[PDB]
Amino acid sequence: SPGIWQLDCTHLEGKVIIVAVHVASGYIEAEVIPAETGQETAYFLLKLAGRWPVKTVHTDNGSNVTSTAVKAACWWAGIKQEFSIPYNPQSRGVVESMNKELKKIIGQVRDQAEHLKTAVQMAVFIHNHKRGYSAGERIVDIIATDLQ
Amino acid sequence: SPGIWQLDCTHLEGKVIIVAVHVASGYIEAEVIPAETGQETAYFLLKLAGRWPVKTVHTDNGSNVTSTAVKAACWWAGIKQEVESMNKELKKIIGQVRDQAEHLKTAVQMAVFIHNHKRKGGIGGYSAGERIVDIIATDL
Numbered sequence: 108s109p110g111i112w113q114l115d116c117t118h119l120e121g122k123v124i125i126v127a128v129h130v131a132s133g134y135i136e137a138e139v140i141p142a143e144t145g146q147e148t149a150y151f152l153l154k155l156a157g158r159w160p161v162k163t164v165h166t167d168n169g170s171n172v173t174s175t176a177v178k179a180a181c182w183w184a185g186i187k188q189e190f191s192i193p194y195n196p197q198s199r200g201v202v203e204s205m206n207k208e209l210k211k212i213i214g215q216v217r218d219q220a221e222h223l224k225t226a227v228q229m230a231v232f233i234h235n236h237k238r239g240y241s242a243g244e245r246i247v248d249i250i251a252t253d254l255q
Numbered sequence: 256s257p258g259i260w261q262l263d264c265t266h267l268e269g270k271v272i273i274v275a276v277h278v279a280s281g282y283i284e285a286e287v288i289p290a291e292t293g294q295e296t297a298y299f300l301l302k303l304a305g306r307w308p309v310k311t312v313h314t315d316n317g318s319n320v321t322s323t324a325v326k327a328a329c330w331w332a333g334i335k336q337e338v339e340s341m342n343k344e345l346k347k348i349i350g351q352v353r354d355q356a357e358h359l360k361t362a363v364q365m366a367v368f369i370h371n372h373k374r375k376g377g378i379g380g381y382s383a384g385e386r387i388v389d390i391i392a393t394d395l
């Protein structure tokens with residue numbers, strides 16, 4: 108489906124790095140966050156939905172994901188929270204693979220930037236616009252096709 | 256065109272709000288930023304290129320958009336460098352939601368959500384977010 112996403116967090120350099128993955132296209136949206144708090148996770152979710160059609164988000168059952176803010180955000184935007192990744196191994200592998208590959212790219216360009224923040228955005232660019240087609244191409248196709 | 260955008264920055268409540276408008280579709284991207292440094296403009300553009308196909312970016316002559324930081328940015332990404340109305344439409348929607356939000360920040364991600372998605376009252380019935388997908392998808 109075109110509106111299914113997976114919000115998880117992978118740590119690096121003693122930093123948090125939030126990671127949202129369009130499951131259908133594999134397109135990724137990532138950003139270094141101060142800490143795995145609820146408001147930070149919610150801001151990220153509010154923005155992703157304000158840019159893409161977000162209808163369901165598969166979270167991990169953590170404290171940040173069950174935060175009152177994340178609930179308010181999922182309600183105000185119409186996002187259906189589903190703590191499924193912790194109990195579905197088929198969905199677990201997806202978040203696992205994307206996080207490690209994103210981690211690989213983040214290292215390949217880490218020396219090209221002093222801060223991790225910039226390094227991850229450079230890594231996101233690489234992942235989405237590189238490859239059939241690239242991830243950023245698949246998601247626009249997925250969405251526009253559904254728009255029939 | 257499918258890759259043409261326009262970067263400018265606006266101030267509200269004494270805070271900076273960077274803004275990027277896909278010209279064909281009217282799709283918006285905004286964020287409260289710390290200050291108009293040009294190093295920030297470069298960061299904002301970098302992730303923007305990471306998610307959307309950014310081919311050219313039409314800016315003004317300000318010091319932030321002309322920084323060498325920005326030039327290195329467009330060079331690593333492939334961007335070719337070169338609006339107030341859209342800026343005031345957001346100021347309006349943000350005024351409608353600011354009283355409902357605790358921080359301008361969230362109020363701008365909320366007013367953005369509305370514009371790109373819950374603003375379908377125009378020719379064709381699509382939202383700005385539906386249009387950019389239409390535009391980019393067609394190019395393919």
Ligand SMILES: CC(C)CN(C[C@@H](O)[C@H](Cc1cc(F)cc(F)c1)NC(=O)O[C@H]1[C@H]2CO[C@H]3OC[C@@H]1[C@H]3C2)S(=O)(=O)c1ccc2nc(NC3CC3)sc2c1
Pocket residue numbers: 146147149150151153175176177178179180183354355356357358361362365
């Ligand atoms: C259940 C919540 C309502 C609890 N609170 C809000 C916080 O949870 C979120 C945290 C957050 C930060 C992010 F960075 C991103 C997020 F997604 C969320 N802040 C927020 O503004 O969220 C808002 C809007 C933005 O996200 C959606 O979720 C909630 C709504 C909704 C749109 S609150 O502190 O108790 C509170 C704050 C102001 C306010 N004004 C009032 N006005 C009347 C005169 C009384 S009542 C009232 C209560």
